[PDB]
From a paper:
The transient receptor potential channel TRPM7 is a master regulator of the organismal balance of divalent cations that plays an essential role in embryonic development, immune responses, cell mobility, proliferation, and differentiation. TRPM7 represents a master regulator of the cellular balance of divalent cations and mediates uptake of Zn2+, Mg2+ and Ca2+, which is required for the normal prenatal development and healthy adulthood. The TRPM7 structure represents a tetramer assembled of four identical subunits, with the overall architecture reminiscent of other TRPM channels. Each TRPM7 subunit consists of an intracellular N-terminal domain (NTD, residues 1–789), transmembrane domain (TMD, 839–1146), and cytosolic C-terminal domain (CTD, 1157–1230).
Our data analysis revealed two distinct classes of particles. The second class of particles revealed by the processing of cryo-EM data collected from TRPM7 in the presence of NTB yielded a 2.44-Å resolution closed-state structure TRPM7NTB-Closed. Inspection of the cryo-EM map revealed four identical densities, one per subunit of TRPM7NTB-Closed tetramer, with the characteristic shape of NTB. The sites in TRPM7NTB-Closed are contributed by the N-terminal part of S3, C-terminal part of S4, S4–S5 linker and TRP helix. Notably, a comparison of NTB molecules from TRPM7NTB-open and TRPM7NTB-closed structures shows that they are sterically identical and do not represent optical isomers (enantiomers).
Author numbering:
A (entry chain D): 3 to 540, 614 to 797, 837 to 1147, 1157 to 1230
B (entry chain C): 1099 to 1147, 1157 to 1230
C (entry chain C): 837 to 1006
Write the structure that this text describes.
């Protein structure tokens, strides 16, 4: 029937009508007054039942003929004579808008609803979250009027208890008594926190007004909140979210829900608070201004398994304050103080007039409520006692119901409340079991509870003894937390597609993910021989560096707040940040290349740039402390990250601000020098020493101690271990310096162009000249070296070597230049000569003309040599970026060109056959007009000074007007638009070009450590040796053990200085000092007004003691 | 004048993509040499006989809840940005330190009304 | 992989991105023909290339009439005022009208049969073609303005002309 409520829930009607006690009121003609006023013992009168069965019985006189044997008059029970029926009510009970819209729900169910059915209602149907706290408020109806001061504290404490725990608040529902003060607390401090606060009012379907207006199946009914003057009944409170309405008889009969509300508390406390915690949901009882039936409710909570605790307030003044006074004058669980019962029972009867007879009956309840003091928490207002009742609500669930501190701690873990756990669980004197704090850590890591991981580490948990292999197997294999939906896609990409449905993840599989993300020759510690054998066997079952293992975990599970926390703890801070920058970057690249409805690539790319910024800020901190030791931090092997290097990790991430940072640029500048001391040399001297080999020995070099921060080769280190440096060592130092390899290739390249310019300008005979064979020998041997750069570069995959190398500009240009040369040399050399006149062989012409065009590639390649300079380099990279940026302005200039050329050719040349010359003529002249050529005497072809007098004809007077418009658009609009484009894009392209230039000095300078000594006409001598030693049989930074110790102390010290100066800059800013002033002046305003009230309590005794 | 004309031109370009893209929902499939085939059909079906966003009833409900929630988040973050600015924190400090200066001087007068009884009760 | 065969044709040809390129390619082929017509010698009767041009501009003009009548606002004269407010819609009106002024002088003229361009009515018809074709190249900026980068520059050229008027007057 498209209604889950109708198949399960229940209305119920009083179908069998028993009249009232004896008496109809007045009005002698008795036959009419038995219908007009006589109520049913149901409670409603006889004309409102309508009783489809007994409607045929009311016509006789009524149901059930007369006197009915007085024992049988009482016989109406709601079980026997009150018949059940389907729904009649559910929908939205939207209150008339005050501050906001304020929707809510209702059900109208029976009394005999089973406890499993009512639990099934709240969770599944109404889409509510299973809570972590139930605050059942209880007090007295209709009494009223807290003070203004106490209204703020009890109001604020009830909210911050519920929004920080995600609690249900069970109220009476109706606006009398408690719920008026519960909702006014919601009026003050809402902050739209009804998403987290779910106040559930359990009222009856009785004393509520406008019950017949709520009649309806799936009806969004409006409901008014106007205080009805003539009436005395109660309305619902506007700031509730859900209503449960129970009817036993009818309007009046003010109790049916006391059992059902209490049975609801039993069902929640039997449900698990979380899918990892065996403890059940706690229930607390808050007591405002109370009553006579309240005392039976408080005692019914304490006498139960489990013993639900009770929180009692004071200051309101009723039975609430009786429980405050009775609990106060009482020590631990003995009978009484001195005999002051005439003072107690007198105080009981001033609340409600009992009169010494059953006021004694209240005292047996007051002596059982002073008995269980441990489960009673009184909140004394006026001495800031126990600090904001939300502490005292949550503390009351820890003092009584004796359980382990583990049970106290894991309860706070579900609430996500550390200030209760720090100040009331980790107190002095608390004794802990051996494995309890470890089980708390395992729960807190899965549940993404960062501030508890911080608390458990400070209170004794060691991650070294904690983080085992099977436990870290679990941390990946949880769905009981915020998981990454991307990790399972990464695992199937490295296991070739096999996916069983259960599939507990192994660490052999995670390592294959890390090696896939880090790329290159990265080898994780999971996929090596030592780990696989001890993984088969299952101390050695622990990890040496646990916080390296969890930092990867937090990144792969996309738990950034956990990752930032686990980064600060442990060693190798700048390295872990660069690894994390790479791991998120690779997952961001996999996210785009994957068919998911949730991209989450911009989230990972932001996370990659956060750790990248941390790496730069640690390098800046290390560079300010000591320049030389910071350059060592860039190049020492890490021994926990696949023997990699902080440069190699940042270059792998393409993290430009690290490579462009002034520390790496000093290191790159010093690797360029080699063992030459180019601070006290000159570039004149390096070039001179290439041409004059004996001039090498007059050059100042660097000592072994001036090179401890520079990585070297293995055999280059052997040269340094031994004015030092005898003769044959100084030749190795010179010719293997990258600066020398450069000029020794540059001078050979300039001599190459001088020859290849000579070849192409001078007449070519049949056989090549001596100059031309030197050219061929260069480009051939130059091509071999380019083949060697491809094969022997970085990445094991041969096709991946290809994709990197064709990504640079001049490497693609070299490929076209090398191929087209031998196409040209082939046509040139391998052609049948004529012997009568050259250039009657069109194959030889085509070969020569390729030389004339191929030489452009080799002059533009001088920009490639010019880009080594600090000033010229950024401009060369700038030219390319400006061409790409101005493309669409130039396209517009090309359409304006064709808009003019086509009509000019059409008007001036009306008698043309189809020819490809027409394509030339519509483009040619209008293009040269952009560049200054007006063609002054071809304008106005019918003039006397015209150089085209035969073109004069019909309508050629239009073309001067066309060309006037053309050049206005080209120079005056489009050329000046293009000047303006470059001006206003200059600074941000010059800036980008500086960083790109500085980034790519790494790949440039680290290439010259691997290039041979000898330039590309003579390099073939070096390729023979390279094949000789390979068939027959990069740089590292060496450190002794006392220099690794001094370096690790430097890395640790500079990280400590980083977080201290970061905290000192935040605490000393103007923004933070104003607000801490703001928060203290707020508290001082509270105290002085409250001390100002105490000193007014002093002057009452001044008038007394003056008397 | 480049930056402020380039800026105006970006907004004008972005504004007029609406009239551009919503025009191509109504244009025929077929281009203007062959479009005459489409104008015969357009006269055939008219004499003889824009886009909407369809939502089911459970998606209109999810959309109205989204509209209400985002407006609630708008006024809350507008009030939190105002109450957390440096301009507003200084003046609420200014107004409270003013009232505290009033009270302490006036409590400072009461405690001077105390020392009249100190000389009395010391006697 | 849902959407059987005859559904995937409806999805393609009714996408606005496809309607664009399917009009753009036809427009570029139009200019290639109409550039050929105007550069090559014109005889008395139009060539096959020239009739395709006329068939385009005629059927292109019908679609512009349809855009006016079937657009938004119930008032017919309000449909007019909105449409002549854009740049290239005014330029299309001059381009369409001046083409058939030129085709009229071109086609409906008494030929000479001894030498072309002794008929000054035929010359005037041809010279209108040579000037009308400027409208249709500048209209490529209208097609170029769909791009995110080129578009703002095309709208920029017009705003800069208006702003520099008084410097150019000086
Ligand atoms: C990492 C990436 C960068 C590296 C790229 C490196 C690879 C670069 C690849 C280069 C290869 C390019 C193609 C070669 C020329 C063939 C085409 C051609 O037009 O041939 C002509 C010459 O035909 C001959 O038989 C004579 C050729 C003599 C040898 C020179 C070409 C090969 C050298 C390559 C050395 C390169 C090795 C470099 C070291 C590895 C055919 O025409 P014809 O015979 O002239 O005319 C016949 C008619 N007639 C006789 C009537 C006139
Ligand atoms: C990469 C970025 C894209 C660039 C854009 C596209 C580039 C433009 C592309 C244009 C296409 C090329 C046009 C020529 C067509 C073939 C010529 C031919 O067949 O014969 C001609 C040979 O003449 C030549 O070969 C020289 C051609 C003119 C030089 C063009 C310079 C570029 C200027 C524009 C640059 C800006 C263009 C602006 C765009 C609107 C001669 O005719 P013939 O019948 O062989 O002999 C006649 C005999 N007679 C000479 C004795 C009288
Ligand atoms: C929403 C807004 C945008 C849409 C706008 C759309 C409307 C565009 C409106 C266009 C109309 C423009 C005017 C038409 C030409 C008349 C002027 C002229 O010079 O005529 C000449 C041709 O006279 C003839 O009689 C021959 C014309 C043949 C038909 C071509 C013109 C009409 C086509 C229109 C198709 C357009 C319909 C498009 C679809 C609706 C008269 O001179 P002559 O006779 O050559 O010379 C006599 C002397 N002799 C013989 C000695 C040489
Ligand atoms: C690949 C890299 C090599 C490295 C470079 C060093 C090794 C290269 C060095 C020398 C090789 C020269 C070839 C040997 C034959 C000598 C004859 C000769 O040249 O005679 C000519 C004199 O010309 C000259 O003296 C120079 C000619 C080339 C111009 C550039 C010279 C400087 C290049 C290198 C130094 C600059 C270094 C700049 C940077 C510091 C006279 O002309 P011809 O020859 O009678 O007539 C030509 C007609 N034919 C072609 C049709 C036949
Ligand atoms: C991956 C690289 C691929 C390379 C492919 C290799 C291409 C090889 C291509 C062609 C081979 C040419 C050999 C001859 C072929 C038959 C014609 C013939 O014999 O002679 C004719 C030659 O006519 C010409 O046009 C010759 C030049 C053609 C090459 C054009 C440049 C291509 C390279 C672009 C630049 C490189 C860019 C590459 C960069 C990537 C005429 O001459 P003849 O007959 O001797 O006699 C004179 C006339 N007679 C007959 C009237 C008397
Ligand atoms: C046999 C005779 C042998 C000698 C003759 C040949 C002379 C040598 C060859 C050429 C001229 C160079 C001489 C000056 C070098 C200055 C040093 C310098 O600072 O270099 C910079 C650029 O280094 C370069 O190499 C820039 C490019 C020059 C070589 C290639 C020719 C392109 C430019 C010209 C083409 C034609 C131009 C158009 C006019 C025709 C690099 O250094 P830096 O960043 O400034 O920082 C200084 C510290 N550092 C050096 C440690 C890095
Ligand atoms: C038909 C008539 C034509 C009409 C005119 C129109 C045609 C002429 C038009 C353009 C010609 C200019 C060519 C250069 C354009 C490069 C653009 C580029 O992407 O550069 C790239 C590098 O490239 C450079 O840094 C270029 C360095 C070499 C200079 C170019 C040669 C010009 C000089 C010799 C000429 C001598 C003249 C005589 C010889 C004939 C940079 O790309 P990017 O955008 O930064 O991308 C981001 C970085 N990324 C690359 C790492 C991913
Ligand atoms: C309009 C703006 C204000 C200007 C006001 C003043 C001007 C009034 C406007 C226009 C004047 C048009 C006629 C002038 C020609 C007279 C001289 C003549 O005969 O010239 C030629 C023919 O010329 C023609 O046959 C005219 C061709 C038609 C032009 C179409 C409009 C052009 C302007 C665009 C539309 C306008 C809007 C443009 C947007 C601003 C010569 O040919 P011929 O006769 O054979 O000569 C003998 C040659 N023989 C010896 C070689 C054999
Ligand atoms: C409206 C929109 C249509 C859509 C376009 C497709 C349909 C249009 C397709 C074809 C129609 C061609 C007409 C049919 C007759 C063929 C004869 C012919 O052309 O011969 C010529 C060869 O010329 C060519 O082959 C092409 C000539 C036009 C230049 C542009 C071609 C590409 C245009 C379309 C494709 C580019 C698409 C680019 C974008 C992707 C030889 O010259 P002639 O003719 O002997 O002499 C002329 C003298 N007369 C004029 C005085 C007589
Ligand atoms: C039979 C053979 C058929 C093919 C041949 C014909 C090829 C096709 C025809 C023309 C060339 C276009 C090819 C490149 C298209 C790139 C796609 C693109 O991004 O387009 C952009 C511009 O889209 C346009 O249409 C811009 C204008 C080009 C078409 C009109 C010619 C004017 C410019 C040239 C005139 C001459 C120039 C002067 C030199 C002579 C729109 O996209 P976007 O904003 O960048 O964003 C991308 C996302 N989006 C696509 C979902 C929107
Ligand atoms: C006698 C000799 C003359 C001397 C020289 C001086 C005369 C020449 C001078 C000026 C000529 C240039 C004409 C364009 C001016 C447009 C101004 C404008 O208002 O643009 C509007 C759109 O317009 C555009 O966006 C223009 C796009 C098309 C390009 C113009 C054609 C030029 C190229 C072809 C030429 C090829 C050459 C060969 C053919 C012959 C924008 O207006 P707006 O200000 O932004 O208004 C606000 C927005 N609003 C519009 C929505 C309200
Ligand atoms: O930052 C770099 C600093 C210096 C150099 C490079 C850098 O990056 C490269 C790159 O990228 C460019 C992009 C656009 C324009 C120019 C370039 C260049 C140029 C270059 O090709 C070049 C010099 N050498 C070889 C040449 C022998 C010296 C190789 C490396 C190179
Ligand atoms: O924002 C827009 C984005 C793209 C386009 C437009 C926009 O606005 C229009 C407008 O306005 C301009 C003012 C000044 C200069 C150029 C234009 C343009 C150009 C244009 O004409 C054009 C493309 N198409 C038709 C052409 C088939 C594509 C129609 C709509 C159009």
């Amino acid at each position: 029937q498209k209604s889950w409520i109708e198949s399960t829930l229940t209305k119920r009607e009083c179908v069998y009508i028993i009249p009232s006690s004896k008496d109809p009121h007045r009005c002698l003609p008795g036959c009419q007054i038995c219908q007009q006023l006589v109520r049913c013992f149901c409670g409603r009168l006889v004309k409102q039942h309508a009783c489809f069965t007994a409607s045929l019985a009311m016509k006789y006189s009524d149901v059930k003929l007369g006197e009915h044997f007085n024992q049988a008059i009482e016989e109406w029970s709601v079980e026997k004579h009150t018949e059940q029926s389907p729904t009649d009510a559910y929908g939205v009970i939207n209150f008339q808008g005050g501050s906001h819209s304020y929707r809510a729900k209702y059900v109208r169910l029976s009394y005999d609803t089973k406890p499993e059915i009512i639990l099934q209602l709240l969770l599944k149907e109404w889409q509510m979250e299973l809570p972590k706290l139930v605050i059942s408020v209880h007090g007295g109806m209709q009494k009223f009027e807290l003070h203004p001061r106490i209204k703020q504290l009890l109001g604020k404490g009830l909210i911050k208890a519920a929004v920080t725990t995600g609690a249900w608040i069970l109220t009476g529902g109706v606006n009398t008594g408690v719920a008026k003060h519960v909702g006014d607390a919601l009026k003050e401090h809402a902050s739209r926190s009804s998403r987290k606060i779910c106040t559930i009012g359990i009222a009856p379907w009785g004393v509520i007004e406008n019950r017949n207006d709520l009649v309806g199946r799936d009806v969004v009914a409006p409901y008014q909140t106007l205080l009805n003057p003539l009436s005395k009944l109660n309305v619902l409170n506007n700031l509730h979210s859900h209503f449960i309405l129970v009817d036993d008889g009818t309007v009046g009969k003010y109790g049916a829900e006391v059992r059902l509300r209490r049975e609801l508390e039993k069902t929640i406390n039997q449900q698990r608070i979380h899918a990892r915690i065996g403890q059940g949901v706690p229930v607390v009882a808050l007591i405002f201004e109370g009553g006579p039936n309240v005392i039976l409710t408080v005692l019914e909570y304490l006498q139960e398994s489990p013993p639900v605790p009770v929180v009692v307030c004071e200051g309101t003044g009723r039975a609430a304050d009786l429980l405050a006074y009775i609990h106060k004058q009482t020590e631990e669980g003995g009978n009484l103080p001195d005999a002051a019962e005439p003072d107690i029972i007198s105080t009981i009867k001033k609340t409600f007039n009992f009169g010494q007879s059953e006021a004694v009956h209240l005292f047996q309840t007051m002596m059982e409520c002073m008995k269980k003091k441990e489960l009673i928490t009184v909140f004394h207002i006026g001495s800031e006692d126990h600090q904001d009742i939300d502490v005292a609500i949550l503390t009351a669930l820890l003092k009584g119901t004796n359980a382990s501190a583990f049970d106290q701690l894991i309860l706070t873990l579900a609430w996500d409340r550390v200030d209760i756990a720090k100040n009331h669980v980790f107190v002095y004197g608390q004794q802990w079991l051996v494995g309890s704090l470890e089980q708390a850590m395992l729960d807190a890591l899965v549940m993404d509870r960062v501030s508890f991981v911080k608390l458990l580490i400070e209170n004794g948990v060691s991650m070294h003894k904690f983080l085992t292999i099977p436990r870290l197997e679990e941390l990946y294999n949880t769905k009981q937390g915020p998981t990454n939906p991307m990790l399972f896609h990464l695992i199937r990409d490295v296991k070739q597609g096999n996916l069983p449905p259960g599939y507990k993840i192994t660490l052999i599989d995670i390592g294959l993910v890390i090696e896939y993300l880090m790329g290159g020759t990265y080898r994780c510690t999971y996929t090596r021989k030592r780990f696989r054998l001890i993984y088969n066997s299952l101390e050695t079952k622990r990890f040496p560096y646990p916080l390296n293992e969890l930092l990867i975990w937090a990144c792969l599970m996309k738990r950034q707040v956990m990752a930032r926390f686990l980064w600060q703890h442990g060693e190798e801070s700048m390295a872990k940040a660069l690894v994390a920058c790479k791991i998120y970057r690779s997952m961001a690249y996999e996210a785009k290349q994957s068919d998911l409805v949730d991209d989450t690539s911009e989230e990972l790319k932001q996370y990659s740039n956060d750790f990248g910024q941390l790496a730069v800020e640690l390098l800046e901190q290390s560079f300010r402390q000591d320049e030389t030791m910071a350059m060592k931090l860039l190049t020492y092997e890490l021994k926990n990250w696949s023997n990699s290097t902080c440069l190699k990790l940042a270059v792998s991430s393409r993290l430009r601000p690290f490579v462009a940072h002034t520390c790496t640029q000093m290191l790159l500048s010093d690797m360029w020098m080699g063992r030459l001391n180019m601070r006290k040399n000159s570039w004149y001297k390096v070039i001179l020493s290439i041409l004059v080999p004996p001039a090498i020995l007059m050059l100042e070099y660097k000592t072994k101690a001036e090179m401890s921060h520079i990585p070297q080769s293995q055999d280059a280190h052997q040269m340094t271990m031994e004015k030092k440096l005898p003769i044959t060592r100084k030749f190795y130092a010179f010719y293997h310096a990258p600066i020398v390899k450069f000029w020794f290739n540059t001078l050979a390249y300039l001599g190459f162009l001088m020859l290849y310019t000579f070849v192409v300008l001078v007449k070519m005979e049949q056989l090549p000249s001596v100059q031309e064979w030197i050219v061929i020998a260069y480009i051939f041997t130059y091509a071999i070296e380019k083949v060697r750069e491809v094969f022997m570069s970085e990445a094991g995959k041969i096709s991946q070597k290809i994709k990197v190398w064709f990504s640079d500009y001049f490497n693609v240009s070299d490929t076209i230049a090398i191929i087209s040369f031998f196409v040209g040399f082939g046509l040139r050399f391998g052609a049948k000569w004529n012997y009568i006149n050259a250039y009657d062989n069109h194959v030889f012409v085509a070969g020569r003309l390729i030389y004339c065009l191929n030489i452009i590639f080799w002059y533009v390649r001088l920009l490639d040599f010019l880009a080594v300079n600090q000033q010229a380099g950024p401009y060369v990279m700038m030219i390319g970026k400006m061409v790409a940026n101005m493309f669409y302005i130039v396209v517009i200039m090309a359409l304006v060109l064709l808009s003019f050329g086509v009509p000019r050719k059409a008007i001036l040349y009306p008698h043309e056959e189809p020819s490809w010359s027409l394509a030339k003529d519509i483009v040619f002249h209008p293009y040269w007009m952009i560049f200054g050529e007006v063609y002054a005497y071809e304008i106005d072809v019918c003039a006397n000074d015209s150089t085209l007098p035969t073109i004069c004809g019909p309508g050629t007077w239009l073309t001067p007007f066309l060309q006037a418009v053309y050049l206005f658009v080209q120079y005056i609009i489009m050329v000046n638009l293009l000047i303006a484009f470059f001006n206003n894009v200059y600074l941000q392209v010059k800036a980008i070009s500086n960083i790109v230039w500085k980034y790519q000095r790494y790949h440039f300078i680290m290439a010259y450590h691997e290039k041979p000594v000898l330039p590309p006409p003579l390099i073939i001598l070096s390729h023979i040796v390279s094949l000789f030693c390979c068939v027959c049989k990069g740089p590292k930074l060496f450190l002794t053990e006392e220099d690794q110790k001094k370096l690790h102390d430097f890395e640790e010290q500079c990280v400590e200085m980083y977080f201290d100066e970061k905290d000192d800059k935040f605490n000393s800013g103007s923004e933070e000092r104003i607000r801490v002033t703001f928060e203290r002046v707020e508290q001082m305003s509270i105290q002085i007004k409250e001390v100002g009230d105490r000193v007014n309590y002093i002057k009452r005794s001044l008038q007394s003691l003056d008397s």
